[PDB]
Amino acid sequence: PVMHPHGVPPSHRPWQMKDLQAIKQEVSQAAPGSPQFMQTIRLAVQQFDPTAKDLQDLLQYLCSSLVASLHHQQLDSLISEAETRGITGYNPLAGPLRVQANNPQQQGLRREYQQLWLTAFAALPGS
């Protein structure tokens, strides 16, 4: 998660088990990508403002190995398409995209990465 308190520099902190547990229990048996699943995960992304790495960890914790593999493939395609368009806050001469999306200071890029990560669930059967 990225902590961005008012008027102080942002910083990354690791996921805490109690936070992950609450997300998993709220999702319960809702199919990945379903309206109930997305309603919960959208709120989790807002509350914890996760980096790209944090989102990989959340996907791995919440979903089966199969769903995670499908999501990985879909998001990789969406990222390639987004790079062709240009992405808010992404400088192609700086770090790898996913490194930049782990930089707490690059909030605009992280938020756009979050949107792509959420959108990748739409490719799954279920919804």
Numbering used by the authors: 1 to 127
What does the paper say about this structure?
Across the known Orthoretrovirinae, CA is a two-domain protein with HIV being the best characterised.
During screening, a third crystal form of HTLV-1 CANTD was observed diffracting to 1.47 Å resolution in space group P212121 with two molecules in the asymmetric unit. In this case, the crystallant included 0.2 M ammonium sulfate. In one of the HTLV-1 CANTD molecules, a sulfate ion is unambiguously resolved bound to an electropositive pocket on the NTD surface formed by α-helices 3, 4, 5 and 7. The sidechains of Q56, H72 and R98 appear to act as gatekeepers that flip up and down to allow the sulfate entry into the pocket. Mutants that would remove a direct interaction with the sulfate or phosphate groups (H71A, H72A, R98A and W117A) all effectively abolished infectivity with a concomitant loss of particle production. As the equivalent site has been exploited for the development of arguably the most potent and longest-acting anti-HIV drug, our structural and phenotype data suggest that similar attention should be paid to this site in HTLV-1 with a view to the development of capsid-targeting pre-exposure prophylactics.
